[PDB]
A paper describes a structure:
Here, we have developed a cell-free protein crystallization (CFPC) method, which involves direct protein crystallization using cell-free protein synthesis. We have succeeded in determining crystal structures of two types of proteins with high-resolution using CFPC. The polyhedra crystal (PhC) produced in insect cells by infection of cypovirus (cytoplasmic polyhedrosis virus, CPV) is one of the most highly studied in-cell protein crystals. The structure of crystalline inclusion protein A (CipA), a bacterial in-cell crystal, had not been previously reported.
Residue numbers in the entry:
A (entry chain A), C (entry chain A), D (entry chain A): 2 to 248
B (entry chain A): 52 to 150
C-alpha cells in the first residue's frame, strides 16, 4: 500500500474528513437538529442550564420563579422565597426577611446551535408577571435579537451563536422565552401543507434537559465538552468542535 | 397519558421518568448525585451503584384511532440527545413496524 | 555465590516456594481454618457479605428479615418493611405501600475455602417463616448440595468453591443456613472423645464478619483481594491466589 | 372401577391416609425436625414468637432485654428503657420515668413439636443479669421441667407440648433458655463418634424465626394455622393437625 500521509490513496484520511464533514452538513439539513441553551448564572457561582433539541424550530419559555436557583435535596428558604416572589410581583407586596434573594439570576447566556438561522431568532424578555413590555396592551410579543448574537468560533468555524446579558441591578427581575428556526435555504417551506403535520409532531418530539451545575468549570468539563456543545465562558474563551472539511 | 384531537405526544427527561413517591422519602439529595453520575461517567458522589428509581422497562400504547405509520419516537441518552451527538442525530425514528 | 535463577543454590527461590506451599498445606491440616461466605446481592448493586472462619467445621444461619438490605445510618422504610415482612410470612398478611421490597436479595452466592470437604456441605434453604420444605412434618433439615459447587481456579489451582442461585421471582422469599466440615483424610475423627471438647470450643472461637459493600467492584477491591479470598464475579471471572508449589 | 368409600380398592383413600401417616412418622425419625417456640405475651396484647427448627436437638436463649417488647418502625422510649434496664439489674440502679415498663413480658409459653422427648427438656430461667439461681456459685445451669408440659391434642393425637407460666408480679424479671432433644428410641446415639460431626453441623443448619404479632388472634390466623403448628390459646383451646392414620 502507499505510505500514510504521502498521497491521494490515504483512504483512512479521506474517510476521517468525510465523517466530520457529513456530521456538520447533516445538522444543517432539514433532517437535522436545531438546539437552544439558556444558562442562568447565580451569585454562588452555580449555573442552571435548560436545553431543548428539535427538528425545524426550537424554544424555551420560563417564568421568573422557574429561573430562580433551586438546590435539589438542600434547604431553599422555600417559605421566604414565596414572600420574595410576592415583593417582586408588586412593590412592597411581600413580607420577606431579605432585601435581595441570592436565588435571582445575575446573568443569562442564550446559545443556539450553528444549524439556526440567526435572522429567525426571537426573544420575549418579560417583567416578573410575564408581560413583554410594561402592559400587555402595548407589548409586541417578541424582539428579533439576531443582530446581537456573537459567533462562537473554533479553528475558524462557527460552532454556535451567543447572546449574553447581565442582570446586575435590583430591578433586573425577568421572565424569559427564546425561539429560533432551523436554517432552510431551499424554497421547500417545512410548514407548507405537505409537511406541516411533521412540524406539529416535532413540537411533541423535542427533547428537554435541565440541571444545576456547581461551577462554570463543572459545566465546561461535564456538560459542554463531553457532548461537543458550543460555549463562551466568563473569560470570553470559545468551546466546541470544528467539523467542516477537518480530520 | 395525553388525549388530543389530530395528533398527540409525550416528552419526558431522564430525571422526570425516575420513580417519585408522593409524600414519602425519595433520597432526593443522593438522587441529584445519581443524576450527575448518569450525565457524565464518575460525574457524581452518590452512595449507590444502581438507583432503584430508574425505570426497568417502558410500554408505549396508542389508541386504535392512531395511524401506526405516523408514530415517531425520540429515545435519547440521559442528556436528551437522540443519537450520541446532536450533529449526527435524526430527531426521531419511525417505530410503527414494531407496534 | 551462584547467580540468581541459574542453579539449585537459589535458596531465596526455594524458601519463597516453601513459604507459599506451607500456607496452602497448613490451611488443609486439622490445625487450619475452614471458611464460608454468603453474598446477598441487592437490586441497587450493593452486596451484603457474611463470613465465618473456624477450625473443624463452619456455618452461617440467617432469617428472611436478616438477609434484607440494611443501609447503616440511612433511611430504611423501617415501618413499611415490618409490613412487607407480614405480607411475605402470610399472603395478604400486611399493609405495605409497595408490591416488591427492593431490600429483598436478587441472588445468593455461597463460597467455601479450599480446606472444606465438598461432600460434607449442607444447606437449609427455608421459606420466609424458616421451614426447610413447606411443613416441618415433611422437612429433611438440609440438602447435600456439594455436587452443585463449581471450582474457583487460578493458575490451575482450586482456590475455593462456589454455589450461586438467583432469586429473580416475586415468590423467591428465603431463610438460609449453610454448613461445611474441614477436610479430614485421616482416620482421626476430630469429634471422637479425645478431641470432641476442642470442637465445642471451636464453635465459641469461630470469628464472624458482616458488611454491606456498595458495588461488586468495591467488594472485589476492598474485601476479596486484600485478604487473598476466593471469588466469582457476575462475569464468571475467578479471583484468589494460587499457593501450592508456586513463587 | 369400585365405587368410592365402599371397598379396600379405594387407592385414593389409602394413599391419602399413608401421605398423612408418612409425615407424622418422618418427623419422629432421626432424619426429622425437632422444633421449639417461645411466646412472650405483652400487656398491649401483642406476642413475640421466637422459633427454632433443627435436627437432633434444638433450643432458644434470650437475655432480659431481648424479651422486652420492640415495635419495629415505631417509638420505643429507647432512652427511658435503657434506664429501666439499669433499675431492673440493680434496685434503684436507674433513672427511669416509670414504675413498670409495659415492654416487660406478662407471660411465657414454651411449645415443643411432638418429635421432642419430653424427659430431655431443660430450662434455664435466670434473673435479669442471666444467673440461673441467685448466684452463679450455687446455680445448677438448668431444671428438667418435662413433668410440667401439657399435651396439646387434636382428635386424640398429641400435636405438641406446652409449658406456660405467668409473670404478673413487679419482681418477675427473667432471662430465658430452653432446650430439647429429638426422640431417639433406638440404641444408635446420634452424638456417638460416627455421627457427632453431623450434630455439630445441625447447630449451624438450625433455622430461626422471630416476629411480633399484634394479637393472639393474628398469631393463630397467620402464624400457627397456615404452618400446621401446635398452639394453646388463653382460653385453653388446642390448635394443630392430627396426621397419624388419618385422612
Ligand atoms: Cl434536506
Ligand atoms: Cl493435621
Ligand atoms: Cl431413623
Amino acid at each position: 500500500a502507499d505510505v500514510a500521509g504521502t498521497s491521494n490513496r490515504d483512504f483512512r484520511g479521506r474517510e476521517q474528513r468525510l465523517f466530520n464533514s457529513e456530521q456538520y452538513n447533516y445538522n444543517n439539513s432539514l433532517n437535522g437538529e436545531v438546539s437552544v441553551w439558556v444558562y442562568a448564572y447565580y451569585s454562588d457561582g452555580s449555573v442552571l442550564v435548560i436545553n431543548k433539541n428539535s427538528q425545524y424550530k426550537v424554544g424555551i419559555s420560563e417564568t421568573f420563579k422557574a429561573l430562580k436557583e433551586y438546590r435539589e435535596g438542600q434547604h431553599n428558604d422555600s417559605y421566604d422565597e414565596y414572600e420574595v416572589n410576592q415583593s417582586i410581583y408588586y412593590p412592597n407586596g411581600g413580607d420577606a426577611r431579605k432585601f435581595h434573594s441570592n436565588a435571582k439570576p445575575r446573568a443569562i447566556q442564550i446559545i443556539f446551535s450553528p444549524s439556526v438561522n440567526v435572522r429567525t431568532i426571537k426573544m420575549a424578555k418579560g417583567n416578573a408577571v410575564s408581560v413583554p413590555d410594561e402592559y400587555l396592551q402595548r407589548s409586541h410579543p417578541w424582539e428579533a435579537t439576531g443582530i446581537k448574537y456573537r459567533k462562537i468560533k473554533r479553528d475558524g468555524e462557527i460552532v454556535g451563536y451567543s447572546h449574553y446579558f447581565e442582570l446586575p441591578h435590583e430591578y433586573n427581575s425577568i421572565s424569559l422565552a427564546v425561539s429560533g428556526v432551523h436554517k432552510n435555504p431551499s424554497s421547500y417551506n417545512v410548514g407548507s401543507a405537505h409537511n406541516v403535520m411533521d412540524v406539529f409532531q416535532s413540537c411533541d418530539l423535542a427533547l428537554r434537559f435541565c440541571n444545576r451545575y456547581w461551577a462554570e468549570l463543572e459545566l465546561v468539563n461535564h456538560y459542554i465538552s463531553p457532548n461537543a456543545y458550543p460555549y463562551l465562558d466568563i473569560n470570553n474563551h470559545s468551546y466546541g468542535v470544528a467539523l467542516s472539511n477537518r480530520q
